[PDB]
Structure 1
Amino acid sequence: AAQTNAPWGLARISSTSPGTSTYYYDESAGQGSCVYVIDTGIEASHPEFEGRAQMVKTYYYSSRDGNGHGTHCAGTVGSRTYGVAKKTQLFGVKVLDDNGSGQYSTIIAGMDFVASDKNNRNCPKGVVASLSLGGGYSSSVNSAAARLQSSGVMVAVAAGNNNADARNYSPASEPSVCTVGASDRYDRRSSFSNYGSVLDIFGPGTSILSTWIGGSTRSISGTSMATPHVAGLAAYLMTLGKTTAASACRYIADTANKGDLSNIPFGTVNLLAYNNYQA
């Protein structure tokens, strides 16, 4: 399948070189897989989700996404026009309030919830959890991310937007999950992207067009935008049967475009998420 005039990020993950505008992908498009977007919620009624999204848990008064961040991330994971895995099932877990913030205790609760909830969902091809959030280092938060990963869920987390070593942030610093850095359309590490030995892979994160609340669209930047690209790619590869939740991160790194990125500090991997699609 091919989406012409696609958002640059989608085009980039299906190309060995920057500058293309077509997103090449397999028609399976992640169907059969499930991706939990642990964020500010998802505007499930957005036409772009085609009824494939639904709120499953909220830690606040409402399950509505009154911020937009979660809806944007969910959109990059699997909205029709802006998503990587256009046929995946999206589950929203609102651990962040409408201002985009949340305490570690509920973020941890949200992760433990997904580890359990997946047991009563029909996700034949696998379960992915996309966490475009984080804060200062916390062994408890890292432990929660490790538990979720250990439970059989492919956990993708944002590296952080502090242009610093991700070792000081959580859950970014948990070695067992998939920590995602951001790049821009010219293959440069995004100026705000964290780096370091703990990063596993890079994904498009600058000027990413996706869904927004109120049935709209918006372009924003952040490792928060790069994360859903790899979470969606994982769901996509899993329904394709190329990898499993336990080894998806390693598989993505093994098959990534290598050495394409500029301004990558020594010690940080120079790997860019790539779907290796060939028609």
Structure 2
Amino acid sequence: AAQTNAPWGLARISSTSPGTSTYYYDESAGQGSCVYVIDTGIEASHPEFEGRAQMVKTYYYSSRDGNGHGTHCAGTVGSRTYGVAKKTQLFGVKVLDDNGSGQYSTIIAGMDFVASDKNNRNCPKGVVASLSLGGGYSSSVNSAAARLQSSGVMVAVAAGNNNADARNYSPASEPSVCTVGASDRYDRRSSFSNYGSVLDIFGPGTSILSTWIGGSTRSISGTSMATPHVAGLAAYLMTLGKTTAASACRYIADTANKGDLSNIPFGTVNLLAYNNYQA
């Protein structure tokens, strides 16, 4: 399949080189997979989700996304125009309030929720979780991310936006999950992207167009935006039968564009997520 004039990040993920604008992907499109977006929520009613998004949990007085952040992320995962996995099922878990904030304790609870909740969902091709959030190092937060992963969910997390070593952030520093740095359309490490040995992969994160609340769209930037590209990619690859929740991060690293990014600090992987799709 070919989507012309796609957001640059979608095009980049199906390309061996920067500077193209068409997104190429197998039409299976992540059908039969599920992605949990653990964030400010999802405006499920957005036309771009086509009935494939649902709120499953909130820790606040509402499950609506009163921010837009969770909605943007979900859109990059699986909206029809702005999504990597255009046919995946999207499940929203509101651990972050409408200011985008959340106590670590609620975030942990949300991770443990998904690990159980996938047993109440129909996801024959596999389960992915996209965590575009983080804070300072916490062993409890990392442990929760490690449980979610061990349970059979492909866990993708943001490296963080401090232009700093991600070892000092959680869940970014957890070894057993997929930690995702950000790049721009010229293949530079995004100026705010964290780095370090704990990163597993980079995805598009600068100037990323996706869905927003009020049924609109906008371009914003962050390792928050890179993460859902990798999450959507994993879901897509799982439906293709190429990989599984336990091996998807490795598989993506293995099949990545390699050595192509600039301003990657010494000791950080130079790998850009790539679907290796041959149209």
Helix, strand or coil at the partner of 1:238: helix
CA-to-partner distance for each residue in 1:76-95, whole Å, 9 max, x for gaps? 00000000000000000000
* Separation in 2, partners of 1:198, 1:55: 31
Helix, strand or coil at the partner of 1:180: strand
Q: Following TM superposition, by how much is the alpha carbon of 1:256 offset from its aligned partner in structure 2, in angstroms?
A: 0.1
CA-to-partner distance for each residue in 1:126-181, whole Å, 9 max, x for gaps? 00000000000000000000000000000000000000000000000000000000
Q: Which residue of 2 aligns with 1:265?
A: 265
* Separation in 1, partners of 2:106, 2:154: 20
* Separation in 2, partners of 1:245, 1:276: 18
Q: Following TM superposition, by how much is the alpha carbon of 1:249 offset from its aligned partner in structure 2, in angstroms?
A: 0.1
Q: Which residue of 2 aligns with 1:50?
A: 50
* Separation in 2, partners of 1:82, 1:257: 21
How do 1:1-279 residues align onto structure 2 when only pairs under 5 Å count? 1-279=1-279
CA-to-partner distance for each residue in 1:164-211, whole Å, 9 max, x for gaps? 000000000000000000000000000000000000000000000000
* Separation in 1, partners of 2:30, 2:122: 14
Number of residue pairs aligned between Structure 1 and Structure 2: 279
CA-to-partner distance for each residue in 1:50-91, whole Å, 9 max, x for gaps? 000000000000000000000000000000000000000000
* Separation in 1, partners of 2:31, 2:103: 33
* Separation in 2, partners of 1:257, 1:205: 16
Q: Following TM superposition, by how much is the alpha carbon of 1:244 offset from its aligned partner in structure 2, in angstroms?
A: 0.3
Q: Following TM superposition, by how much is the alpha carbon of 1:229 offset from its aligned partner in structure 2, in angstroms?
A: 0.1
Helix, strand or coil at the partner of 2:155: strand
Task: Give identity over the alignment, percent.
Answer: 100
* Separation in 2, partners of 1:213, 1:241: 33
In structure 1, runs of 5+ residues without a counterpart are none
* Separation in 1, partners of 2:90, 2:120: 15
Q: Following TM superposition, by how much is the alpha carbon of 1:120 offset from its aligned partner in structure 2, in angstroms?
A: 1.1
Helix, strand or coil at the partner of 2:157: strand
TM-score, length of structure 1 as denominator length: 1.00
* Separation in 2, partners of 1:158, 1:173: 10
Q: Following TM superposition, by how much is the alpha carbon of 1:26 offset from its aligned partner in structure 2, in angstroms?
A: 0.4
TM-score, length of structure 2 as denominator length: 1.00
Q: Following TM superposition, by how much is the alpha carbon of 1:265 offset from its aligned partner in structure 2, in angstroms?
A: 0.4
Helix, strand or coil at the partner of 2:262: coil
Q: Following TM superposition, by how much is the alpha carbon of 1:39 offset from its aligned partner in structure 2, in angstroms?
A: 0.2
Helix, strand or coil at the partner of 2:36: strand
Q: Following TM superposition, by how much is the alpha carbon of 1:124 offset from its aligned partner in structure 2, in angstroms?
A: 0.2
* Separation in 2, partners of 1:56, 1:198: 30
* Separation in 2, partners of 1:27, 1:98: 35
Helix, strand or coil at the partner of 1:130: strand
* Separation in 2, partners of 1:77, 1:30: 10
Helix, strand or coil at the partner of 2:232: helix
The structure 1 segments of at least 4 consecutive aligned residues displaced by more than 6 Å after TM superposition are: none
* Separation in 1, partners of 2:89, 2:110: 18
